[PDB]
Amino acid sequence: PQNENARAEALNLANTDSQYLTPTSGSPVRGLIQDHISAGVWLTSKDSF
Amino acid sequence: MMKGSRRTGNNTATTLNTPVVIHATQLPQHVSTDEVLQFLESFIDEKENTNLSSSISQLKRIQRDFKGLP
Amino acid sequence: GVHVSYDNSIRDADGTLVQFMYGGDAIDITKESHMTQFEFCLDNYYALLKKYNPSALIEHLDVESALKYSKKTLKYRKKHSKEPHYKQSVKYDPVLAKYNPAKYLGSVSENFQDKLESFLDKNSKGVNEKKFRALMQLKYMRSLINPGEAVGIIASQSVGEPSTQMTLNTFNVTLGIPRLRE
Amino acid sequence: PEDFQQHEQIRRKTLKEKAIPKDQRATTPYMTKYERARILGTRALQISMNAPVFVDLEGETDPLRIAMKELAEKKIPLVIRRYLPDGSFEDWSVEELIVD
Amino acid sequence: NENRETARFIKKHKKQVTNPIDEKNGTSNCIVRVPIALYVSLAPMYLENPLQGVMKQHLNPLVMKYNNKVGGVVLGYEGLKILDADPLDTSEKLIKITPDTPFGFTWCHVNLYVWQPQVGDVLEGYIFIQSASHIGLLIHDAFNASIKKNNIPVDWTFVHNLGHWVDSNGEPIDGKLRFTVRNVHTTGRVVSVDGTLIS
């Protein structure tokens, strides 16, 4: 976008940080997906020292 | 051609240079020589406490006109 | 062109009125997640207090006018609960229809007030019950829908988009998308 | 000349009937996330056209980060005109609104 | 049919206030004061000094030039006053910023002193040249005028030396000459008053 009115709306209205919850039901849509999931079951395990 | 760009500069009337609309809000009420000469004494004094110097130079001839003599 | 107006009524673009509040409670969907999670809001009371910070805020909004009217509509409504809906007396219209939810503290949808009083009367736990009312009623006030919000596009994108997910066949009544297309 | 004088007089009377006075205004006292995203847009758009700036900008070259510094100090000289859908309106200075 | 058809055309072209001959001098009065209204664009560099901005952008390029709306040469202005967009006088007025651009547009009242020459009037100015085809003049030491040959009286002859003039009595005419106004020409960036000497 090519002016300052639109830069103030890609930072404050349509940025990704304000889009954490979707308005369909209020459920979150942003998070770690495949292998950061399967690494937290090993990192936060009880064997990890 | 080039003259199609010179008349963009010969016109040079943007919305920064010119007002958008002008409307007279009453009727033109005439004045007296004692009121013209009182005004030009104050209008020239206000601007002389750029542009406009080529204009004021034409007003001082009219200030010399209503009272003085070449 | 359906959007939240500044008097919290949902109106069309030409000004024709569609609803009088957004859903009856004027709450944004992306805000009401922990609004009824009262056990979470009590375990994190102090960390949630300097977010919904009330100290710099009690001079720009009336406080006691809506709390006074709410207890009339709460006491009068429990005296008439065994009656059916057509024998309900209409003395006390709800507090959202009398006070602006973003202007008056305590003006609160009557379903949130019932859940909040059911929590405080079955749970006796450095935090009072009086100051926990004051937090969860300011949290209702900060979770409201904003005026100008395009709730018409959102309501249409919240139906057409999960309907790209139910195109399937028989697993008696018309199912799925062809029912939704009627 | 008379048809304009009787036309401006209508227009300044119509816009007088639609101005809600400051004691009758009954909308939200918070800044509603779109007012914030346009005040910062319009103020940063004026700063880049050499408007006088009311904050000690410390080498900040982004015009938008300058206007976010003035909104933090309540120094922005703008006024929000909140329209109600009949055409009537309420004027709210940025100084008196509340920033979420 | 046509009685109330051309009235919205004829009254478009009839000028409003006619110039009177005054003070038993025979000369008309063409300087007039008209209050007008403008819709101007205040710029953000003049957002702290709004009155200097409306004068320097829109009012100063308007002086000593022919304006079509007031119908004359604008001499100067007096009493600039910005209309507030807040119908509450006061100092802290406020104007309305456009959405796309950072500029603001607003209404203003001002009094313009304009010079309004019209037909059938009397203007006395100095003769600056005279030749074998015309009599060229100034008006008020600023406004160019000319009297051509076909409106010179027949009883007046052009004696040749550049050349002097002979009236109906054998006298050179001075600079100050009284004449009656023909079509005022506009189309240049110079305002020209063509005139007549016959009655």
From Swiss-Prot, chain B:
GO terms for cellular component: nucleus; RNA polymerase I complex. The keyword Phosphoprotein applies. Its main location: nucleus. GO terms for molecular function: DNA-directed RNA polymerase activity. One of its GO terms (biological process) is regulation of cell size. The N-terminus is blocked. It comes from the Eukaryota. Keywords: DNA-directed RNA polymerase, Nucleus, Phosphoprotein, Ribosome biogenesis, Transcription. Transmembrane segments: none annotated. It is found in: Nucleus, Nucleolus. DNA-dependent RNA polymerases catalyze the transcription of DNA into RNA using the four ribonucleoside triphosphates as substrates. Component of RNA polymerase I (Pol I) which synthesizes ribosomal RNA precursors. RPA14 seems to play a role in the stability of subunits RPO26 and RPA43. In vitro, the RPA14-RPA43 subcomplex binds single-stranded RNA. Present with 3100 molecules/cell in log phase SD medium. Component of the RNA polymerase I (Pol I) complex consisting of 14 subunits: RPA135, RPA190, RPC40, RPA14, RPB5, RPO26, RPA43, RPB8, RPA12, RPB10, RPC19, RPC10, RPA49 and RPA34. The complex is composed of a horseshoe-shaped core containing ten subunits (RPA135, RPA190, RPB5, RPO26, RPB8, RPB10, RPC10, RPA12, RPC19 and RPC40) where RPA135 and RPA190 form the DNA-binding cleft. Outside of the core, RPA14 and RPA43 form the stalk that mediates interactions with transcription initiation factors and newly synthesized RNA. This is DNA-directed RNA polymerase I subunit RPA14.
UniProtKB/Swiss-Prot annotation, chain C:
It is found in: Nucleus, Nucleolus. It comes from the Eukaryota. Signal peptide: none annotated. Present with 2840 molecules/cell in log phase SD medium. Component of the RNA polymerase I (Pol I) complex consisting of 14 subunits: RPA135, RPA190, RPC40, RPA14, RPB5, RPO26, RPA43, RPB8, RPA12, RPB10, RPC19, RPC10, RPA49 and RPA34. The complex is composed of a horseshoe-shaped core containing ten subunits (RPA135, RPA190, RPB5, RPO26, RPB8, RPB10, RPC10, RPA12, RPC19 and RPC40) where RPA135 and RPA190 form the DNA-binding cleft. Outside of the core, RPA14 and RPA43 form the stalk that mediates interactions with transcription initiation factors and newly synthesized RNA. Belongs to the RNA polymerase beta' chain family. DNA-dependent RNA polymerases catalyze the transcription of DNA into RNA using the four ribonucleoside triphosphates as substrates. Component of RNA polymerase I (Pol I) which synthesizes ribosomal RNA precursors. Besides, RNA polymerase I has intrinsic RNA cleavage activity. RPA190 and RPA135 both contribute to the polymerase catalytic activity and together form the Pol I active center. In addition, subunit RPA12 contributes a catalytic zinc ribbon that is required for RNA cleavage by Pol I. This is DNA-directed RNA polymerase I subunit RPA190. The gene is RPA190. The chain holds residues 1029 to 1224 of 1664 of the full protein.
Swiss-Prot record, chain D:
The keyword Transport does not apply. Keywords: Cytoplasm, DNA-directed RNA polymerase, Nucleus, Phosphoprotein, Ribosome biogenesis, Transcription. Residues 57-78 are annotated as: Leucine-zipper. GO terms for cellular component: cytoplasm; nucleoplasm; nucleus; RNA polymerase I complex; RNA polymerase II, core complex; RNA polymerase III complex. It comes from the Eukaryota. DNA-dependent RNA polymerases catalyze the transcription of DNA into RNA using the four ribonucleoside triphosphates as substrates. Common component of RNA polymerases I, II and III which synthesize ribosomal RNA precursors, mRNA precursors and many functional non-coding RNAs, and small RNAs, such as 5S rRNA and tRNAs, respectively. Pol II is the central component of the basal RNA polymerase II transcription machinery. RNA polymerases are composed of mobile elements that move relative to each other. This is DNA-directed RNA polymerases I, II, and III subunit RPABC2. It comes from Saccharomyces cerevisiae (strain ATCC 204508 / S288c). The chain holds residues 55 to 154 of 155 of the full protein.
Swiss-Prot record, chain E:
GO terms for molecular function: DNA-directed RNA polymerase activity. Its main location: nucleus. One of its GO terms (biological process) is transcription initiation at RNA polymerase I promoter. Contains an average of four phosphates per molecule. Keywords: DNA-directed RNA polymerase, Nucleus, Phosphoprotein, Ribosome biogenesis, Transcription. It is found in: Nucleus, Nucleolus. One of its GO terms (cellular component) is nucleus. The modification Phosphoserine is found at residues 192, 199. Present with 4070 molecules/cell in log phase SD medium. DNA-dependent RNA polymerases catalyze the transcription of DNA into RNA using the four ribonucleoside triphosphates as substrates. Component of RNA polymerase I (Pol I) which synthesizes ribosomal RNA precursors. Besides, RNA polymerase I has intrinsic RNA cleavage activity. Through its association with RRN3 is involved in recruitment of Pol I to rDNA promoters. In vitro, the A13-A43 subcomplex binds single-stranded RNA. Belongs to the eukaryotic RPA43 RNA polymerase subunit family. This is DNA-directed RNA polymerase I subunit RPA43. It comes from Saccharomyces cerevisiae (strain ATCC 204508 / S288c). The gene is RPA43. The chain holds residues 8 to 251 of 326 of the full protein.
